[PDB]
Amino acid sequence: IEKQQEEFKKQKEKEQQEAEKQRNLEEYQKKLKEKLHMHIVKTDQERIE
Amino acid sequence: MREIVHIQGGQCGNQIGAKFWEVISDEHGIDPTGTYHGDSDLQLERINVYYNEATGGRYVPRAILMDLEPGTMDSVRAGPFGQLFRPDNFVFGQTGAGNNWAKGHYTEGAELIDSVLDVVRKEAEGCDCLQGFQITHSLGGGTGSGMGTLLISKVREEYPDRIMETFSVVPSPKVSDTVVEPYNATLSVHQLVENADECMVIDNEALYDICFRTLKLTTPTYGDLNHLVSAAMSGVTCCLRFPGQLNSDLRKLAVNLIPFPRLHFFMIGFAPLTSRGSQQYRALTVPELTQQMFDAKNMMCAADPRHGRYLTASALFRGRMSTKEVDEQMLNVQNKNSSYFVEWIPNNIKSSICDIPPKGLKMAVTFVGNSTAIQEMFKRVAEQFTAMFRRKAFLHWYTGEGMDEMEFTEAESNMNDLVSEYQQYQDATA
Amino acid sequence: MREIVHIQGGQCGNQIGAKFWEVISDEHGIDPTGTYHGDSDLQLERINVYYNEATGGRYVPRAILMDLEPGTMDSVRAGPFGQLFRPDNFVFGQTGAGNNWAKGHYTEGAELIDSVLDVVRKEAEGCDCLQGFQITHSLGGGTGSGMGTLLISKVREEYPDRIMETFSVVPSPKVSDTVVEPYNATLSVHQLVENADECMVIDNEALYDICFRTLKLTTPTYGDLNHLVSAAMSGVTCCLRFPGQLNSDLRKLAVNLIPFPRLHFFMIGFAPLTSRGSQQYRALTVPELTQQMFDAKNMMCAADPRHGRYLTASALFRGRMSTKEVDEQMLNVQNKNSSYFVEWIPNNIKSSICDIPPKGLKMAVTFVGNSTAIQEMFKRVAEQFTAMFRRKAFLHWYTGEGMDEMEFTEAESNMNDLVSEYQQYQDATA
Amino acid sequence: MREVISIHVGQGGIQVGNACWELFCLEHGIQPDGQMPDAFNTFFSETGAGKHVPRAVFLDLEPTVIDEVRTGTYRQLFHPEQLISGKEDAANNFARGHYTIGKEIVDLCLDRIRKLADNCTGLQGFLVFNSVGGGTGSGLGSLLLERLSVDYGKKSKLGFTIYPSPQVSTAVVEPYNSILSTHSLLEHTDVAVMLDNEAIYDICRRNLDIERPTYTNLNRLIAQVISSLTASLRFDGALNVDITEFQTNLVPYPRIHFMLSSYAPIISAEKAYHEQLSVAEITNSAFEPANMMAKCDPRHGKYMACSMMYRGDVVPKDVNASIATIKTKRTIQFVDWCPTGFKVGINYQPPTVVPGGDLAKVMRAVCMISNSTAIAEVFSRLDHKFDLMYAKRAFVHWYVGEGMEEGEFSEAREDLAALEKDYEEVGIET
Amino acid sequence: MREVISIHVGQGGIQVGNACWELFCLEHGIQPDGQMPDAFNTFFSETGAGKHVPRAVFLDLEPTVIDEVRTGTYRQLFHPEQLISGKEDAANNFARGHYTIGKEIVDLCLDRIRKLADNCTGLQGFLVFNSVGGGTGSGLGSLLLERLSVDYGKKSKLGFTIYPSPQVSTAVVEPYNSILSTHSLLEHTDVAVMLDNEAIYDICRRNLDIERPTYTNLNRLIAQVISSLTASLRFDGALNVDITEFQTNLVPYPRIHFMLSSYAPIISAEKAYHEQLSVAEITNSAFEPANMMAKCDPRHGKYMACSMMYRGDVVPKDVNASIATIKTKRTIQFVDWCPTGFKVGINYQPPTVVPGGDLAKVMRAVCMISNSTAIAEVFSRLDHKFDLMYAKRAFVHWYVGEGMEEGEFSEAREDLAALEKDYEEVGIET
């Protein structure tokens, strides 16, 4: 019986960590893309000049 | 209208043409006596693309055959469909080049080329609206790789706005038949990049690999390699001779497959290809064609296309089929392989549909893709060239006919620069 | 829709498939030339489950045949219905494994498996909606028990959500034909529990016992054992190819027969089975089918089912019959045998009815029961394994190809742990 | 200007929908093609010229039953694109049909429901049929009810669920999804009617004298009950009853809406006409505990309210004279806080007979819908079955891996405990 | 005394012109030979005795499509010298068809336009068709529009351009010329209608149930939309609408004139007659986001004005009762400064069916032309695609060498940025 409770406790903890990790990665990628676009705009101005 | 003339040089080019013209004649129903015996009306509507008209109702190809020795053209005349060629277009010398690039480009090829240029000028000035020229030659031979490439520059100097095609066989290090192959390969690649609007590399090693693995026939011969090359050659201009949903001439492919003027070296492949015993098992569907079309072993070059990323790709479907399926399959082949497609140019696959399939087949596809994986061939060619040149081996043969080592150094440097700047875009990111 | 592909490996698996496909073709009225000649409309409605369609109207099985030696596939092609198999799906090596598990799983089986995985991927990516895979192989041979089990892991890694079937013949100690059977049986059981969604054990000893006692035929041969195994194999997926009162695909059986993910080793049996001379005496009724279905001698395994308690049971009735009788008989077979059914899970028998009986029979039943009595087979296999391993007999053959004794120790420990935890629930009480 | 929409989900739901839709078409004179060779408007809609279209939708993830429907004699009746079908079955897994594959199908069903509802002007309510002991049935029924409860709000929905028998069972895992579905429809359905198979089997055996019944015989009786319930909306009667006039008469409290039904007379033509079938004897037979349509004993509990429908040539005074006799009997006792508990409806149209069926033609019939305190026994026994396997967490991995949380099982148990406590609290006298 | 002239340029333009000209000839009873065996005057002209000549001109530089037209069944219909054809194709290069080869052809087209216009007395306006993602189409359309805007001035011109799909594409360079052509027609065309292929593919797949569509199926739907738009000029109706009555009702500001269309019902004869096709349900289907003729989501933006045409036996009161329902819904919201946004037209002539086509015959239909704020997404994604390749100046050499200046690419980008800012500025509430 001890094994049964322990087994479910160890499995439950797993799954939660995987979902959280995916969410963090996606947010980071979107912010980085915005910064890159602004940097590109300044570079564009110099070549045009 | 918008027709092209055929020019071939060397033994390899003559043997390629001897099957290309047979394939074209069989496609248009022209008997080896020049008399039409076809079945369909469409077989005659656009016959002016490749064939001229003479009195008596017979047709004659507008091909020009040149070599520095008379044997190969004296042999091709006795073969099937050998009588179609006009005897006036045969031009040859009495000496030969002996696989020496200098002899076929400086001493002997320079004096003879005036006569062949005369007939070339006669053919081009006359035709209704010129589309361009297509050239078949081998880079492993002296007379071919010299005279053909000098003729390329001479033609380009007089017709700067027309389009130019070259189907070039480069010497692979696996199946080597000549010891001086690296020298005249490296010298020819130097001149070929400056003038050819399109170039299509073909390797004998890849043809043997295809024949042994896909067709699974026991004893390949030059006739099978020539037949595969001829089918691939015919597939490119099919929609220019037949109606279709989306016609696309050679210039349209030139616009869509060459991003920068110096990146015009493509590798091609033909589908479907099946063995005799398995031709009944398979069912011809668009997914079956597209899965074999992008197969790595199906390429006509030993270059491995999953060692690099495609800059762009093209497909010329044949037969009557739905366009929605073609577009969705092209999208699917590009979503499942995003790692092998460059990311700063979206939607880099061109498609075209022609309603007339090849004789005997219900569907066919010709694939022309510009990929960064082609660098490996120039790398190995330059490696062999620099391994042989550092000791000045066989250099006296070339230097005894007015050539010097400076032109070798410049050729090596330009070829290495091409190799470097071709891969420069592989690591480029947005 | 919801179709499955067939993959078989080794000589035993190839011989099983050579009769399984004959039985399927005879059931669907397909001639050995691939031409349909059936009588009923229902024979064609769900033919996409096992057969593909090609041009010319003929049908081709989606089976993949693999072995490390070419003899068995070169022999199965000359047998009846041997022409149906596509020649492209035949993949084989030139060396063989020699009943050595290490050679068929580490050195030789690793390099070859890429080609067979290519065609496996081709078959699965194409099909409408995948249901899963079914695998036939033997645990008494080297190449089979190695390459098949490694292929199981490779397939599971790429399709984690699909279902996987394995029909596995384990070496019995009574009829032993190979001295190194315990080693590759124990090594294979280690990998098989981790990846297979369902496993069905079959023993040659039980097949001989059945043939000698129930059918009472004088001279059993491998053709009769193969025919019984083929009938049992076909009985499982019958309702997926035909209409019925309660359709039940493989996934529904997976849900209802596996309580815990590591307990998926079933033993099966087929009814009715009668001798030629007594086929006129007997009358086919539901009580007659159910009394033979739960008979201990009717199981396809030597394991004695009254030496343990059933965790769950399943029955797949065939033919047109009343459901009330089926349910009441299932209740009666469970009230009169309460001692042999585990008590903390009530109503542990699943039933299904299919209205299409086998050709030539009016009623048939396929039985799949998960019982605790299967521990005895692993006990004797491990007993022989530990009797042979303690002296390191025949160990050098395995250790000379990169394997070590640590993988033997881990396999023995995991197998013993499986044996223990499978019987743990036998003594469990509520 | 009064309409009702019936929803059929799952194999059992579709198989009882077929049963009710032969009966309605026969009762309104509509041929199987849908063509007549103003009462139809309750179940059908006029297309302007000719055929009638049922106000019904068929749902299933497993395509076999729908394909059988679309090829039978009724292929022309139903609109082609209201027979929504999936590709992959839920396989008795509740979590599948509520979280994985049902969500992608539920949107099409809701679009069809909207398209059918915009046509109706006087929509009385919805009917839904689903066998509870299955994955897709219970899961999709729960999801559809939950979506409808918020899309429409106060519209009445009636559920004809078929709970598993006390001891007879076809699956092994049906208590889990039965409990979960009871949780889901406890707070979402206005009326739920008990329909377990064992009681109807006993009814057929005792009265119809059929020793080998099939599912069709059960479904015909259920169809007759549905027709008797909905007759008052489409036929003239001396004492009419509407669907909306139920929660004011049979449902004392919002939580308590599970009731069990009965029907009378049930008799075959071979011995029907030998006896007079007076109203008193049929209303006595309807209250017999052995004629309950669900296997529950009414003698074990009090009655709360009885709603019972007549049809034929019955006179109200004879009905009153029989209600008095039932109030007289000492074996039937009502709850203390309910002095009168009978709601009576009388209709003139006699029940219609289906050719080739079991029931004969009679001029009088009675259908009762009775709410009683004794229903708690089925909940208690289902709870006991659930606890046995949930103690060891058996079969839970098949549900946790389909997106459902671990704690979802416990709260259904708590809601059943609350319901059982509520049923005990209501039944005690003041 | 009311006329309109349609201009067809490019392969897509000619292939949709063929599609509309079968439909018009069929709708006015004119045989393919042009002979009838007073409404024709809008599209045709009387020759004095016998045949009718369309008021249309076909343009292309590539001769294949025109030659196909001049040999089909419609060879006798069109005037022989209004099918202007070139010799050399632009090959997807915009600079070619605007600076190099289009200039020498545009004069003949303008002469033909003058010769057709002098015949008309009540010229309503011009129609033009051109696929945007091609060289000759976009370039010649731009040049013709620019010439017409100054030759005639205030005459109205309508453009049915086909923009590329979001992800599906046939070329690789079509964003460049799409952006340039949008620049050109932004300040030169009064109305532009969105027509990308992907949305119409989805429409065919979902409603027409065709799994393998070709271009003809798309062009027939476009032809039906054109016929519905122009029906009000040549048939009697209770509420007429003229072409000149558009910029006063759909165009709030001179810059904003890109709108997207939809059509309803779209249904096949196999299941059309089973449902009543009321006006309410068709006007609901027309507003469904999945039935937009361009792949844009209207839920992502506000509406500005909706102009929607009916034809058949529809009654105005039923139209008003359905406009009220749409105003009621919470998922469709109009812009703040527009209280009423609907313009309604009613015509009596039902849509005509083309034999062998997809659509069935129905008595009611609705065609909507709606201007919405959500259209900015296609501009944003085309701009993003353009920027990726313009960052590295890819494919620019194919345009600079055809006479176009380097800076011409930047100002189109600036105009698109201005348009996107304007669309954001308009959609904010006060």
Ligand SMILES: Nc1nc2c(ncn2[C@@H]2O[C@H](COP(=O)(O)OP(=O)(O)OP(=O)(O)O)[C@@H](O)[C@H]2O)c(=O)[nH]1
């Ligand atoms: N009364 C009656 N019950 C049925 C019938 N068919 C199936 N059932 C009951 O339904 C239960 C299982 O659910 P099913 O309807 O068979 O299957 P399902 O609801 O479609 O769920 P899935 O298994 O996922 O397909 C069984 O326990 C049966 O008792 C029928 O024809 N009549």
Ligand SMILES: Nc1nc2c(ncn2[C@@H]2O[C@H](COP(=O)(O)OP(=O)(O)OP(=O)(O)O)[C@@H](O)[C@H]2O)c(=O)[nH]1
């Ligand atoms: N809807 C529709 N679009 C088409 C059709 N044909 C071509 N297109 C579109 O047109 C685009 C390319 O322009 P085309 O019309 O094919 O060629 P073009 O306009 O004549 O320009 P050129 O290539 O110079 O000849 C492709 O991206 C297609 O999406 C058609 O029949 N129907």
Ligand SMILES: Nc1nc2c(ncn2[C@@H]2O[C@H](COP(=O)(O)OP(=O)(O)O)[C@@H](O)[C@H]2O)c(=O)[nH]1
């Ligand atoms: N495909 C094909 N290749 C050939 C044939 N004959 C020769 N070759 C290739 O051409 C190369 C030699 O070229 P060569 O004959 O010296 O060219 P030349 O100097 O212009 O005459 C060899 O490496 C062969 O691989 C042929 O008939 N078919």
Ligand SMILES: Nc1nc2c(ncn2[C@@H]2O[C@H](COP(=O)(O)OP(=O)(O)O)[C@@H](O)[C@H]2O)c(=O)[nH]1
């Ligand atoms: N049922 C059946 N079993 C077979 C047959 N042939 C061999 N076997 C069994 O397979 C075992 C040997 O397997 P083996 O041929 O070495 O498998 P492999 O190593 O994969 O080729 C023996 O113990 C036999 O009992 C057959 O035709 N039918």
Ligand SMILES: [Mg+2]
């Ligand atoms: Mg089912």
Ligand SMILES: [Mg+2]
């Ligand atoms: Mg074109």
